[PDB]
Amino acid sequence: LVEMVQALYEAPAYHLILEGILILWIIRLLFSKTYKLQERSDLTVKEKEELIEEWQPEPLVPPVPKDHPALNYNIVSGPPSHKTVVNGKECINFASFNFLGLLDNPRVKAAALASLKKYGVGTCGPRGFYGTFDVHLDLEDRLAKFMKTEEAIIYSYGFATIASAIPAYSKRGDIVFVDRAACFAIQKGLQASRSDIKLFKHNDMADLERLLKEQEIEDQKNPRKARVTRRFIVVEGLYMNTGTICPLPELVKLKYKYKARIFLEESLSFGVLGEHGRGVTEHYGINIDDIDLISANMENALASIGGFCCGRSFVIDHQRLSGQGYCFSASLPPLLAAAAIEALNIMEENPGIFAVLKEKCGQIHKALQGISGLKVVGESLSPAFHLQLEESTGSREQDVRLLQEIVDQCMNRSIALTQARYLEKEEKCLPPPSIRVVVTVEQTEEELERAASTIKEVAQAVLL
């Protein structure tokens, strides 16, 4: 070997460079695993034209079946409120999410009319370009003070609120643990972001613990990647699809033990739970600072269009520049904002309406128990719950038809009920068909018991 080294050293430089490049060439041939065939063919103009001519597209919309229950919309001849007229029949409203009866107060209408006189209807632009009014800032300050939180942000549409809040913080590569029974807005927000989604059983902290333990096991394998991966837990204060509350304290413990932030959705529970009606945090006594982001809409309780998100400035300031429903859309009309402000004033003046609503919900939930063919799904504290078929048929269409039969027969009996509506092909976890019962402080005890008796009679007559 030494003699070979000396002989190689005896060689000129160009000769050795040539030998080296030849050896590199040999390596390239040896590792040229691609077996090219040396061919090239292209299509002909007539071939392209005939290929274009063969193609025939599908219709834009599929042919419609005439049996669609959703093809028929109930028509309300007037404002949806207590003693409404549905399909020309005078009824009592048990279907509209108007918990505090703030839709038809004279004060709310007066404030809305004053703002309409001052400003008009439209805002004519986004918040960036001369679409910010003083009413918007006033309402944001009022919401922040009401929720005992640093900052709040307003969207002009309930769906877009959470559907734009979620993708702003969760990006591609992060992990989101979301409850199985989550509203469609949360699902669309999670789809808009490209993060990894891990569903867990409804209100089951055992499954959440198992998933978090699996995630920690995966973190132990590649710590470098685990140091740049964020974890979120998206839950609802009061679920719409089931009517059940969520266990906050266990979620807070799991957050602080596994380093995973919490996003709370509080559309149903914003103005109905707690002594002062600030959500489920007052119901459980949890500190507001433990929850990173709280999202609600101003439609169910405040009886006006819009939505909002509340939190610390550190998290809220990001949405003013990353929320798509905020940056690329017109701001909320001033009269709706004034109505929301007046509703907040009314809620702050007297907090006994929440107790009244709680007691009415207790009465109606206790009275409704005992139907032969129907079962109540939901908690006693929920203002809106469900009635479901105890024994169901093989297919869903017959269940829907039976529920609509019950609804129509009740509506002929001066009780206006509604049936829960879903997108069958789109929902991640499709809930069973059910009849939705909604409670309002306007409803009297006699009306509630009359509704319970009528529902019992109609259900036992129809299911039998």
Is residue 370 within the footprint of another protein (CB under 8 A)? no
Is residue 418 within the footprint of another protein (CB under 8 A)? yes
Q: Which of residues 14-53 bind another protein (CB under 8 A)?
A: 41, 43, 47-48, 51-52
Q: Which long-range contacts (CB under 8 A, 24 or more apart) does 169-174 make?
A: 169/230, 169/232, 169/293, 169/315, 169/318, 170/195, 170/230, 170/232, 171/195, 173/228, 173/229, 174/229, 174/230, 174/231, 174/232
Residues whose CB falls within 8 Å of the CB of residue 126, separated by 6 or more in sequence, listed in order: 327, 328, 329, 330, 331
> For another protein, how many residues bind (rule: CB under 8 A)?
110
Closer of 400 and 463 to another protein (Cβ): 400
Is residue 88 within the footprint of another protein (CB under 8 A)? no
Is residue 76 within the footprint of another protein (CB under 8 A)? yes
Closer of 126 and 373 to another protein (Cβ): 126
- Of 10, 13, 46, 57, the one binding another protein (CB under 8 A) is 57
Task: Kindly state the DSSP code that residue 122 receives in the 8-state scheme.
Answer: -
Task: Quote the least distance from Cβ 177 to another protein, whole Å.
Answer: 15
Task: Quote the least distance from Cβ 112 to another protein, whole Å.
Answer: 5
What span, in angstroms and rounded, lies between the C-alpha atoms of 29 and 424?
Answer: 58
Is residue 394 within the footprint of another protein (CB under 8 A)? no
The closest of 130, 129, 100, 139 to 335, measured between CA atoms, is: 139
- To 5 degrees, how large is the angle CA 149–CA 183–CA 177? 75
Closer of 377 and 463 to another protein (Cβ): 377
**H helical segments located in 290-420:** 313-316, 319-322, 324-327, 334-349, 352-368, 396-411
- Of 20, 122, 249, 351, the one binding another protein (CB under 8 A) is 122
Is residue 373 within the footprint of another protein (CB under 8 A)? no
CB 165 within 8 A of CB 316: no
Q: Which of residues 251-270 bind another protein (CB under 8 A)?
A: 256, 259, 261
Element (DSSP H or E) covering residue 233: strand 231-236
Closer of 7 and 228 to another protein (Cβ): 228
- Of 228, 285, 350, 352, the one binding another protein (CB under 8 A) is 228
Q: Which of residues 292-311 bind another protein (CB under 8 A)?
A: 297, 299-300, 303-305
The closest of 232, 263, 266 to 165, measured between CA atoms, is: 263
Is residue 225 within the footprint of another protein (CB under 8 A)? no
DSSP secondary structure, 146-214, as one string: HTT-SEEEEESSHHHHHHHHHHHH--TT-EEEEESS--HHHHHHHHHS--EEEEE-TT-HHHHHHHHHH
Is residue 117 within the footprint of another protein (CB under 8 A)? yes
Is residue 61 within the footprint of another protein (CB under 8 A)? yes
> Which residue do the tokens 């290929």 mark?
51
Which region among 9-17, 102-110, 363-371, 398-406 touches another protein (by CB under 8 A)?
A: 102-110
Residues whose CB falls within 8 Å of the CB of residue 154, separated by 6 or more in sequence, listed in order: 136, 139, 140, 143, 306, 307, 308, 331, 332, 337
What span, in angstroms and rounded, lies between the C-alpha atoms of 397 and 399?
Answer: 5
- Of 92, 133, 147, 442, the one binding another protein (CB under 8 A) is 133
What span, in angstroms and rounded, lies between the C-alpha atoms of 375 and 390?
Answer: 6
Site string (158-197) toward another protein, x via CB under 8 A:
xxx--x-----x-------------xxx--x--xx-----
Closer of 31 and 73 to another protein (Cβ): 73
Is residue 198 within the footprint of another protein (CB under 8 A)? no
Task: Quote the least distance from Cβ 351 to another protein, whole Å.
Answer: 21
Task: Quote the least distance from Cβ 79 to another protein, whole Å.
Answer: 4
Which region among 353-361, 386-394, 413-421, 447-455 touches another protein (by CB under 8 A)?
A: 413-421
The closest of 414, 359, 413, 367 to 387, measured between CA atoms, is: 367
Task: Quote the least distance from Cβ 44 to another protein, whole Å.
Answer: 9
Task: Kindly state the DSSP code that residue 290 receives in the 8-state scheme.
Answer: G
Task: Quote the least distance from Cβ 118 to another protein, whole Å.
Answer: 7
The closest of 273, 450, 241 to 357, measured between CA atoms, is: 273
- Of 32, 34, 56, 350, the one binding another protein (CB under 8 A) is 56
What span, in angstroms and rounded, lies between the C-alpha atoms of 376 and 340?
Answer: 33
Sheet containing strand 374-377, strands side by side:
374-377, 384-389, 434-438, 418-419
Task: Quote the least distance from Cβ 138 to another protein, whole Å.
Answer: 11
Q: Which of residues 316-355 bind another protein (CB under 8 A)?
A: 317-318, 321, 324-325, 327-330, 332-333, 335-336, 339
Closer of 50 and 275 to another protein (Cβ): 50
Site string (137-156) toward another protein, x via CB under 8 A:
x------------------x
Is residue 249 within the footprint of another protein (CB under 8 A)? no
